[PDB]
Design a protein around this ligand. Structure first.
Ligand SMILES: [Ca+2]
Ligand SMILES: [Ca+2]
Ligand SMILES: [Ca+2]
Ligand SMILES: [Mg+2]
Length: 429
C-alpha cells in the first residue's frame, strides 16, 4: 500500500503546470534583464533545482561580488531588474512576471573563503546539492509536503522546523523519502548526521553537519520537540501509511459554549494576556513571545498557581499569551520564613513587624502568616506584567508596558485564539 500512497502524495507535492509556467516565464525574463546589465549571478533556490513544493514557487538570485561595500550596487541591480521592490544582511525582494524573487549580494568566491559568512555560503550549498539531488527532486517534495502537512516545514522561528536545505541533505543522505522516514524512526536527541562523511554517530545534540562547513548544524533551528514529533510521525506512518499524513489537518470547529464546558470540566483557570503586536519581523517577534510566555509561566510556577501549559498567538494587530493553571484561587494567607531562633537581632526585627496573626516557631525557625497581594493567577499576572514587563522581551515588554489586558471566559473564546486553546488543552475532533 505504501508505494501506492506515495504515488497519490505526488499529486499534492508536485507543482501544477500553470505555476511551473510562471516560474519559467519569470526566470527567462529575469535573466534577460540581468544579462543586459552584464551582471554575474546564479539562481540558488529550490526553484533552480526543481525541488520546490507545489504552491511555494519563488526565485533566489544571488549576485557575485568582490569589493566590501556594494550593499548599494545590489540595491541598484535588484531595484532595476524587479518589476516591484521592497526590503551584511540587506537584500532586495520583489516580483518579476508575477513571481516572488529575492536578489541577494555576496562574493563570487574562489571556493571556501566565506567572508563574514552567511550569504556567501548559499552558492556553495547550491553547488554541492545541484549534482547530487538530480533525479530525486520529487523525493525532496514528498519530504517537504510531509513536513508541511504536519506544520514542521520551515526553519523560521515561527516554525522551528526543517529548512528546505535540510530536506535536500536528508534525501541525499538516505536516497529517498521512504528511506528517510524509515531511518528517522531511530533518530535520537543526540543523533549526528554527518552527510559529507556518510556516517551517523552520537553527539551532544541533534546535529546535521553541513557538507560545506563542518562546524555548522543545518538543523540548528529544528526544535527538540519538532524533531520528536517528526520521529513519532515517521513511526506512525510506517505503522499505517495514509495519504492523510500529506494533508493539512482541519481547524477544530468548536463553539464558545463548548470551550467553556471543556474548561469548566477541566476545572482550571484559562486566560490570556492580550496586547498590541509590536512592529517587528516574525523572526524577532516569535522569540520574544516564547520568552514572555516562559517568564510568566515561571512566575506562575513560583507563585504556586501550578501552570499546566502555555501558548501564544500573533494576529495582525494583537498578540496573545495563553495560560492554563490548576489553581483558580489560592488563600490570602501564606507562610513567610523567618530566622533561626538563635539569631536574636534578626528575630527581634522579624517580630517587630505588625501582622494580623502571631508568628510562630517551627523546626527551630520563626515563621509568620502574611498576606498575598493577589489570590488568582489572573491577578498575579496583572501584577507581574505591570512591573516586570522588561523581562518579556524588548519589544513585547514595551508594548505590554503601554497596554495589556487579562482576558478569560467567553470574552477570551471570542478572540482569534481558539485553535491555540484547543491545541494547548489537547482537545480532539
Ligand atoms: Ca508555530
Ligand atoms: Ca508548531
Ligand atoms: Ca483576589
Ligand atoms: Mg526566497
Amino acid at each position: 500500500k505504501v508505494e501506492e500512497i506515495l504515488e497519490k502524495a505526488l499529486e499534492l507535492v508536485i507543482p501544477d503546470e500553470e505555476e511551473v509556467r510562471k516560474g519559467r516565464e519569470a526566470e527567462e525574463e529575469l535573466r534577460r534583464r540581468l544579462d543586459e546589465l552584464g551582471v554575474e549571478y546564479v539562481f540558488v533556490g529550490s526553484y533552480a533545482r526543481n525541488t520546490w513544493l507545489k504552491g511555494s514557487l519563488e526565485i533566489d538570485v544571488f549576485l557575485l561580488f568582490p569589493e566590501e561595500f556594494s550593499k548599494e550596487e545590489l540595491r541598484e541591480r535588484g531595484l532595476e531588474i524587479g518589476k516591484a521592490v521592497l526590503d551584511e544582511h540587506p537584500y532586495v525582494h520583489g516580483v518579476v512576471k508575477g513571481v516572488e524573487v529575492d536578489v541577494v549580494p555576496c562574493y563570487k568566491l574562489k571556493e571556501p573563503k566565506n567572508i563574514k559568512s552567511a550569504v556567501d555560503r548559499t552558492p556553495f550549498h547550491h553547488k554541492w546539492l545541484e549534482g547530487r539531488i538530480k533525479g530525486k527532486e520529487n523525493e525532496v517534495r514528498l519530504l517537504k509536503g510531509f513536513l508541511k502537512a504536519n506544520g514542521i516545514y520551515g526553519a523560521e522561528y515561527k516554525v522551528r522546523g526543517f529548512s528546505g536545505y535540510l530536506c535536500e541533505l536528508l534525501i541525499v543522505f538516505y536516497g529517498s523519502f521512504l528511506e528517510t522516514v524509515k531511518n528517522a524512526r531511530r533518530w535520537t536527541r543526540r543523533t549526528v548526521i554527518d552527510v559529507a562523511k556518510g556516517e551517523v554517530r552520537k553527539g551532544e545534540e541533534f546535529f546535521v553537519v553541513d557538507p560545506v562547513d563542518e562546524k555548522r548544524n543545518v538543523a540548528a533551528n529544528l526544535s527538540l520537540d519538532n524533531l520528536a514529533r517528526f520521529v513519532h510521525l515517521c513511526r506512525e506512518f510506517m505503522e499505517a501509511p495514509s495519504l492523510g499524513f500529506f494533508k493539512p489537518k482541519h481547524p477544530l470547529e468548536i463553539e464558545p459554549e463548548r470551550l467553556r464546558k471543556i474548561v469548566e470540566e477541566r476545572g482550571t483557570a484559562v486566560f490570556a494576556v492580550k496586547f498590541r503586536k509590536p512592529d517587528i519581523v516574525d523572526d524577532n517577534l516569535y522569540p520574544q513571545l516564547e520568552r514572555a510566555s516562559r517568564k510568566i509561566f515561571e512566575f506562575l510556577e513560583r507563585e504556586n498557581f501550578m501552570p499546566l501549559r502555555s501558548a501564544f498567538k500573533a494576529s495582525e494587530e494583537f498578540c496573545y499569551l495563553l495560560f492554563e493553571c490548576q489553581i483558580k484561587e489560592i488563600s490570602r494567607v501564606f507562610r513567610r520564613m523567618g530566622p533561626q531562633f538563635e539569631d536574636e537581632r534578626n528575630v527581634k526585627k522579624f517580630l517587630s513587624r505588625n501582622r494580623a496573626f502571631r508568628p510562630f516557631i517551627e523546626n527551630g525557625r520563626w515563621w509568620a502568616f502574611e498576606m498575598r497581594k493577589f489570590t488568582t493567577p489572573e491577578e498575579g499576572v496583572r501584577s507581574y506584567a505591570s512591573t516586570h514587563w522588561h523581562t518579556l522581551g524588548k519589544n513585547v515588554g514595551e508594548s505590554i508596558r503601554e497596554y495589556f489586558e487579562i482576558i478569560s471566559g467567553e470574552k477570551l473564546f471570542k478572540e482569534p485564539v481558539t485553535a491555540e486553546l484547543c491545541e494547548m488543552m489537547g482537545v480532539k475532533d
